[PDB]
Amino acid sequence: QTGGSFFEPFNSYNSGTWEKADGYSNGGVFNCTWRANNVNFTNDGKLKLGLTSSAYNKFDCAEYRSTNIYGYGLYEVSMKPAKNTGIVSSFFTYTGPAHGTQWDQIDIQFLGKDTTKVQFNYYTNGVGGHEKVISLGFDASKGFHTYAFDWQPGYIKWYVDGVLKHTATANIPSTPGKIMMNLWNGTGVDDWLGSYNGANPLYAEYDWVKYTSN
Numbered sequence: 293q294t295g296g297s298f299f300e301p302f303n304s305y306n307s308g309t310w311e312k313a314d315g316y317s318n319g320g321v322f323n324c325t326w327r328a329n330n331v332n333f334t335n336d337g338k339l340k341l342g343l344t345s346s347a348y349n350k351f352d353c354a355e356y357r358s359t360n361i362y363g364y365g366l367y368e369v370s371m372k373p374a375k376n377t378g379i380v381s382s383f384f385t386y387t388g389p390a391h392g393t394q395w396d397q398i399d400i401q402f403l404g405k406d407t408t409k410v411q412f413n414y415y416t417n418g419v420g421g422h423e424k425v426i427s428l429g430f431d432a433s434k435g436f437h438t439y440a441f442d443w444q445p446g447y448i449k450w451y452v453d454g455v456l457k458h459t460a461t462a463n464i465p466s467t468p469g470k471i472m473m474n475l476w477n478g479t480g481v482d483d484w485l486g487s488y489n490g491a492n493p494l495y496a497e498y499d500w501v502k503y504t505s506n
């Protein structure tokens with residue numbers, strides 16, 4: 293069954309509860325290869341995802357994924373996304389074809405082109421289009437703040453430091469998924485992310501993640 297409530301402080305790599313994407317690229321808009329070497333833990337207990345390069349116009353990025361799958365409940369994360377044109381730092385639930393299910397996800401994405409805003413979205417059976425951009429009232433890249441989504445049968449509610457910022461009720465996903473965090477540079481989506489200018493290294497940091505089931 294779907295995993296139970298938990299609290300992850302990111303003190304170290306726990307290959308029992310989390311996995312590091314490694315040796316492949318998502319392709320498409322993801323113009324980088326996931327590297328386990330890019331998922332690291334600081335001395336002070338922060339997950340630190342890195343976007344790096346060791347070759348011309350060639351980038352290595354990072355994705356950390358839960359081994360367990362999770363359903364309806366409250367998802368919270370304290371993080372500090374990267375700031376730079378053409379990148380994304382994220383916290384999200386995901387399942388899809390590569391997992392042997394329909395595409396259901398709920399996502400928080402910080403577009404590096406403007407870290408004073410955040411984007412919320414979700415997909416149900418591969419149908420998305422629920423994008424919402426929210427002004428934060430601060431630059432997220434400058435400190436750790438707490439972001440969350442409460443995923444329930446008839447709604448998703450997103451919060452920033454406990455303040456309700458947006459509510460969705462239409463066609464809410466139901467297929468349990470992995471909790472994931474990633475940092476990556478885009479290609480072919482300059483209008484959305486800005487073009488990426490190869491700045492490296494860049495990092496997204498996460499202090500903890502908490503999930504509370506129904």
Ligand SMILES: OC[C@H]1O[C@@H](O[C@H]2[C@H](O)[C@@H](O)[C@H](O[C@H]3[C@H](O)[C@@H](O)[C@H](O[C@@H]4[C@@H](O)[C@H](O)O[C@H](CO)[C@H]4O)O[C@@H]3CO)O[C@@H]2CO)[C@H](O)[C@@H](O)[C@@H]1O
Nearest residue numbers: 316317318355380382384386388390391397399401413474
């Ligand atoms: O293990 C099985 C097999 O699959 C492989 O990797 C898969 C991986 O399992 C899977 O999670 C992955 O899913 C990605 C989607 O393709 C991509 O669309 C999705 O993008 C989301 C956005 O939709 C969302 O808005 O924002 C977030 C954050 O910015 C974004 O990530 O992201 C997911 C997760 O990365 O695709 C992989 C490749 O198909 C392995 O490659 C293969 O070797 C394994 O055998």
Ligand SMILES: [Ca+2]
Nearest residue numbers: 301302337499
């Ligand atoms: Ca921590």
Ligand SMILES: [Zn+2]
Nearest residue numbers: 436437438453
């Ligand atoms: Zn705050």
Ligand SMILES: [Zn+2]
Nearest residue numbers: 424457458459
């Ligand atoms: Zn709204």
